[PDB]
Write a protein that binds this DNA or RNA. Structure first.
Lengths: 56, 120, 110, 46
RNA sequence: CCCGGCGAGGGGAGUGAAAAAGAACCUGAAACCGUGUACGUACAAGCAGUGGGAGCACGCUUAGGCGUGUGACUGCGUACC
RNA sequence: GUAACGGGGCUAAACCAUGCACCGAAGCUGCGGCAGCGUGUUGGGUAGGGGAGCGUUCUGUAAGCCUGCGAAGGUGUGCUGUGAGGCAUGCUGGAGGUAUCAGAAGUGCGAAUGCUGACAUAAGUAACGAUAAAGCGGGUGAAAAGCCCGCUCGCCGGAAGACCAAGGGUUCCUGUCCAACGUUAAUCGGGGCAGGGUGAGUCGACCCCUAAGGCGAGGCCGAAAGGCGU
RNA sequence: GACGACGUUGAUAGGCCGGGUGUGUAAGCGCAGCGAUGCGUUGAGCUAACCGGUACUAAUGAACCGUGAGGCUUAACCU
């Protein structure tokens, strides 16, 4: 199987309607240090519920 | 067709799965903290904890079952001497999981997994 | 006043950057950096480097404060491409295209 | 499978070399044509 | 001098008549690909135009049915060699 | 799938005979403009015949005219003729262009499964090249699944180990670098840059001798070239 | 993708504890026998997805979207 005609920029752009992205919208501010992290993730250097993990 | 089944497959055959989980369990028991992907750490808990509840009772037969798994001798000696009496007054739940984001080679959701107190 | 920072001959295809560049147009620059740091895409790293170039570009050479910039214009353009060949079955030889792209980001306070 | 060029040096220089091109008259004409065009490689070099 | 990895890539300063001549360097069109602005589109069928035609937006005249852009609705209409 | 009026539908909106109006074409008229042929009459047209023209390059008129107060070219707007087209001006452009009448042509592009260069759609879709398998801690750095160090697991073992001859020709070792090559990233490499490295009386070649075979003083044969042979 | 449940005021999932099921006398020790082995401690030991309890572990205080009494005309009722 192969095509028979050339679709325009209109149909090619129309098919790309739902292929766009989304913002992560899942950020939060740590209650102690004021630095930011995703929900239910530890921060860049290891704070979660104010408790000290390896921090490396 | 997956109705009320249990156990992940991890895109490997069975012997490879058993060998990897034995190796991981040995490494965690030795080092007390590791950093692995999330679907491995969510399945590791079903394997590591029965060893720890096995270590609470000192019988020679139970020692040789504990050596029958993990095929290691310094690991089983880390059990029954240090990791045994640490959780002797705790009912279940000896490891904990904390998600820690993504990798940079293949974007896999990693997770720290560590014992409860770590004495550290 | 308008402030320009562009980035020529980046090593990414020009269609894969409009999925990321569409997310941050018109936002404030701190919230844009917050969104852009935590996206697991290569174009996120590229356009974040461009944005942190642009804000310091406005701050040193022009001033324009800092806490109140708003990313005003952002778009991407086709760049020069490189031809290569890729062998196939039955002696057929077909060429492949490695594409580049041009980033431009203009920030302002107005 | 087995292809159509298994190389050698003696079999090459014995039937394409400079000395085997001067043996005949037509070989000398071949060398004359090669010199008349202006090529850098007349017959072969090491 | 600043951002950046002591990178690639730019922004200020400077030389120059000109840097929208900066080395991939005179002039720089076309297919192709984006960003902004004005209007139109989510109950209506088909060589995508043509004749009619309300509304909206922008300039002039001091309205005066003028100009430019868009085209709800409608009669007709099956590309080229 | 109604399907033997175009449809809705009609007991006249059917048929037969008569009569009075109206709708109906690029036909005829009224109005304005052009051209052909003798005031009249004509003016759709393939194959073909006849007539009149526009534009481009170069030569003479030209040591003439325009031009840095802006030539050729590129992009808009407005005006004019019956058409090919002509004229003026805004912006870009940075040194050449040509009036009038004559002359000579590499003189007018949409199609030939035409030729060369550039760019799309299919599409961010199939694919990533043996189903022998990986897991964790430490160091370097901007970035670590893939590089270095260490612990464990797995595969071959008449080979997927070690060595020669043909063949390739600096791929060998060290330091340094990541734009291009590596079907992904790379600090890594058989990649880029700079330096270093092969030691023979006994190993092979060279050297002495021949087999199949080639060349071959004289000689034989052949128009020339040449063929065979001591 | 969608749908259903739960987010500490909690049984949503993993674990622990008891039970059920499956397999069929674990290891160590002693006895008889030169030995293969048999006998007792003992229906012992182990047990994926099942049933029920248990907060030991993980479901964080949060941030984003959605507004401020809802146009006109006419008729009918109440004031």
């Amino acid at each position: 199987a192969v095509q028979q005609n050339k679709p325009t920029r209109s149909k090619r752009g129309m098919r790309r309607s739902h292929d766009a992205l989304t913002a992560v919208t899942s950020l939060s501010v740590d209650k102690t240090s004021g630095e930011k992290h995703l929900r239910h993730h530890i921060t860049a250097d290891g704070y979660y519920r104010g408790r000290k993990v390896i921090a490396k | 067709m997956r109705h009320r089944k249990s156990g992940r497959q991890l895109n490997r055959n069975s012997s490879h799965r058993q060998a990897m989980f034995r190796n991981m369990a040995g490494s965690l028991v030795r080092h007390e903290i590791i950093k692995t992907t999330l679907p491995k750490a969510k399945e590791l808990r079903r394997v590591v904890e029965p060893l720890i509840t096995l270590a609470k009772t000192d019988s020679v037969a139970n020692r040789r079952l504990a050596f029958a798994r993990t095929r290691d001798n310094e690991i089983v000696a880390k059990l029954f001497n240090e990791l045994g009496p640490r959780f002797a007054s705790r009912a279940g739940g000896y490891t904990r999981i904390l998600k820690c984001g993504f990798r940079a080679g293949d974007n896999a959701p990693m997770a720290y997994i560590e014992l409860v107190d770590r004495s550290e | 006043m308008e402030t320009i920072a562009k980035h020529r001959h980046a090593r990414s295809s020009a269609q894969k950057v409009r999925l990321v560049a569409d997310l941050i147009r018109g936002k404030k620059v701190s919230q844009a950096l917050d969104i852009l740091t935590y996206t697991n895409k290569k174009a996120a790293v590229l356009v974040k480097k461009v944005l942190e170039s642009a804000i310091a570009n406005a701050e040193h050479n022009d001033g324009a404060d800092i806490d109140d910039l708003k990313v005003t214009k952002i778009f991407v353009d086709e760049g020069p491409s490189m031809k290569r060949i890729m062998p196939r079955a039955k002696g057929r030889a077909d060429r492949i295209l490695k594409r580049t792209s041009h980033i431009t980001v203009v920030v302002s306070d107005r | 499978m087995k292809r159509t060029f298994q190389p050698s040096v003696l079999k090459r220089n014995r039937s394409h070399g400079f000395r085997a091109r001067m043996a005949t008259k037509n070989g000398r004409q071949v060398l004359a044509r090669r010199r008349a065009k202006g090529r850098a490689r007349l017959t072969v070099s090491k």
